[PDB]
Write a protein that binds this ligand. Structure first.
Ligand SMILES: NC(=O)c1ccc[n+]([C@@H]2O[C@H](COP(=O)([O-])OP(=O)(O)OC[C@H]3O[C@@H](n4cnc5c(N)ncnc54)[C@H](OP(=O)(O)O)[C@@H]3O)[C@@H](O)[C@H]2O)c1
Ligand SMILES: NC(=O)c1ccc[n+]([C@@H]2O[C@H](COP(=O)([O-])OP(=O)(O)OC[C@H]3O[C@@H](n4cnc5c(N)ncnc54)[C@H](OP(=O)(O)O)[C@@H]3O)[C@@H](O)[C@H]2O)c1
Ligand SMILES: [Ca+2]
Ligand SMILES: [Ca+2]
Lengths: 401, 401
């Protein structure tokens, strides 16, 4: 009754995406899908127009599911003969939608973490706006002065700052963020943690960046005091600012069960460290949530798995883990279901997640999880299923459920 | 015959520092020491002049050992009634000396890592110059335009970049780095890895910061090709650039035995994550090495342990781990010894490190390491020694050795 926006992708994830749709989704669910092909080739052909069209379609319809895509760089420009080094589609969509990207591991009882203390999941809430990701940078090739100016819109004295006099070359960068965006990030994070009844931590480096990072600290503190502190206390949870240095140490030590609000760059980096620590990138989920909770975009917290695609391309069997991709579909459909008051669709999504977990906990799993259990040296082919075998096995149990 | 420059510090580390000197160093070694008290109180009193004097003394004499110090922030300004929010002494010294800070864990056979894959130490080489640590930032409180200008020193068109038009407040920041400093960082890292015969990785985000981070990538690549590639290949090692996202995942997965060159901020953050993953900050070493290897500053890879100092202040027994601090002294004295051709001093330093490791591997250890072995819930007072008991035990075995 509502529509689901689908964004097709690249390389190994695109092949798996087709299998997931045809095997675990379309046989059981009839939902109207608006489709956008975000393959590298179609982005180049459409001069990246598909990307922004897809983003606006998610805003219109309320829910999107996205397959991993290639982010061009020098090598990719050569590989595909790109017209331009097109921007990351993820940055474009997240820019258009706004919001915070919540990343969380999927834990199976029988798959150990790499970190021995980790008992419960940790959620990273990544601020998907500003800083490095909309920065302007340049190489300095001659002697000269880098300075910044702030120019008030009502005339009156521009403020100037001399940063550096280069003599023998270097680099320069400026970046910004906004009160509006920081306040939206804070609200998303307080709301997420409150719904979970988990505590909340914000990491910054305000110790060095007294003004830039101090703005994050002050905005979260203001918002906690005004709007959330009483509700948090009543639920037996709390919010705390932490020095980024201390926070990464805490994360190693802690058993989990907290929400961790991260600035754009820290969320990007620490999410991968977290994912890998929990066992595998194939078991890490990602959901962008707009401020208010009414628009989401769900994806796997990993890329296109091009190393595996290379093996796929030369006819070799691959056991890349489809679980995060499937959970993208289940959580997107669950959001679609709730808006639509469709309890049977919602129950289907829960049931598919349940059988995936049951399947793995009983010993049927892809090679990455076999490795977490046995160690890379000790796994043999009979210890795991290939990707299609894993998905076929899941559909079997799904059909009895 | 040469002189050792000593920089006294703050809180818990200052108390331990005195005990280390009096118990494990001065009874066995006669080296001239030039002393600088970098306590919070003496930095305030001298308007931070002691800090820069101490730094220049290290440059003059070639070797410094430093105790952890307080870096002022808003709360510390109130606590000590500081005249100003003085800059981090570590940033000041590292600024004055130049160089790369190499951070490495001390592994004991019987103390497990938190990360189950970790077998050998990892060395982080932190670039101790530029980026966030010499950046200019500001809060924007009115509508206005942030722009950057590059002004060539030979007249002729300034290059201008419009970054943002603020309407409802935000933040702005500019930062730089230099070709000279990046090239010194690269050389330190290639040399360090080559002497170890370990491979070398550089992490960047050149995927987003094409110019700023691309400069790091290009400089290391240029230097490898010109100066190190053949020597690395001949030793069976290599150098590789890595996306920071991939690199933190690699670090979780890998058994260790590589050098990891990190930009200023990444080195700061990832060093603490690494340290904690290996078991305890009390077992992480830090050495600043200038480009050429002729000036060093050695310290513990941790702060003043103020949480423990708080307990110390109210007469409670503390078991803070002195090992990193002692290794600061041993590695500083070893550098002093090599310059001076003093083989007996060098052998003493090696012997003290040896007995510290032997002491722990036989079950005599501070509370942090007991916790790594037994789990926090299961440790009881008889499982560990307090700090002085640990140091006294070490001196005992040292005396028979
Ligand atoms: N959201 C997105 O659209 C997104 C996000 C990140 C990257 N990317 C793009 O994806 C492409 C490749 O990026 P990347 O190699 O840096 O990261 P990646 O695709 O996440 O793969 C990195 C490595 O992590 C492991 N891994 C990731 N997903 C896995 C899964 N489902 N099952 C098992 N193992 C998995 C694999 O290790 P082994 O090879 O050791 O098995 C893999 O080679 C690039 O073009 C990048 O731009 C897209
Ligand atoms: N090089 C330097 O001079 C330097 C470096 C960093 C920080 N600092 C300064 O040091 C002060 C405190 O900083 P911080 O609390 O962020 O970091 P910290 O002093 O490293 O202590 C953080 C926590 O790590 C654990 N830890 C650190 N060193 C330890 C040791 N030797 N033995 C056992 N456990 C240890 C303790 O955990 P538990 O409390 O859980 O036992 C401790 O509270 C601040 O004023 C900061 O500015 C100085
Ligand atoms: Ca990433
Ligand atoms: Ca630090």
């Amino acid at each position: 009754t509502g529509v689901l926006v689908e964004l097709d992708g690249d390389e190994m994830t695109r092949v798996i995406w087709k299998k997931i749709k045809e095997t675990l989704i379309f046989p059981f669910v009839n939902v109207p899908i608006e489709y956008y092909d975000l393959s590298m080739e179609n982005r180049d052909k459409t001069e990246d127009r598909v990307t922004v069209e897809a983003a606006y379609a998610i805003k219109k319809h309320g829910v999107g599911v996205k397959c991993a895509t290639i982010t061009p760089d020098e090598a990719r420009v050569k590989e595909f003969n790109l017209k331009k080094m097109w921007r990351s589609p993820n940055g474009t969509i997240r820019t258009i939608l706004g919001g915070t990207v919540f990343r969380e591991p999927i834990i199976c009882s029988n798959v150990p973490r790499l970190v021995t203390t980790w008992k419960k999941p940790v959620v990273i809430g990544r601020h998907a706006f500003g800083d490095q990701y909309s920065a302007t940078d340049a190489v300095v090739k001659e002697p000269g002065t880098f300075e910044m100016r702030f120019i008030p819109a009502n005339g009156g004295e521009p403020k100037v700052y001399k940063v550096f006099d280069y003599k023998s070359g270097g680099v320069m960068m400026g970046m910004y963020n906004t009160d509006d965006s920081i306040r939206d990030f804070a609200r998303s994070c307080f709301e997420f943690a409150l719904a979970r009844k988990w505590p909340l931590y914000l990491s910054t480096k305000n110790t060095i960046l007294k003004h830039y990072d101090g703005r994050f600290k002050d905005i979260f503190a203001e918002m906690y005091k005004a709007l959330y502190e009483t509700k948090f206390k009543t639920c037996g949870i709390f919010y705390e600012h932490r020095l980024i240095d201390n926070m990464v140490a805490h994360c190693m030590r802690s058993e989990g069960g907290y929400v961790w609000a991260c600035k754009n760059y820290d969320g990007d980096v620490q999410s991968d460290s977290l994912a890998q620590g929990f066992g595998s990138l194939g078991m890490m989920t990602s959901i962008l949530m707009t401020p208010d909770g009414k628009t989401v975009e769900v994806e796997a917290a990993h890329g296109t798995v091009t190393r595996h695609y290379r093996d796929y391309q030369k006819g070799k069997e691959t056991s890349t883990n489809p679980v995060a991709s499937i959970f993208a579909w289940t959580r997107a459909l669950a959001h679609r279901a709730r808006v639509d008051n469709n309890n049977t669709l919602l129950e289907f999504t829960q049931r598919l997640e349940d059988v995936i977990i049951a399947t793995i906990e009983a010993g049927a799993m892809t090679e990455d999880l076999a490795i977490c259990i046995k160690g890379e040296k000790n796994v043999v082919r009979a210890d795991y299923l290939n990707t299609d075998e894993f998905i076929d096995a899941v559909s079997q149990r799904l059909k009895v459920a």
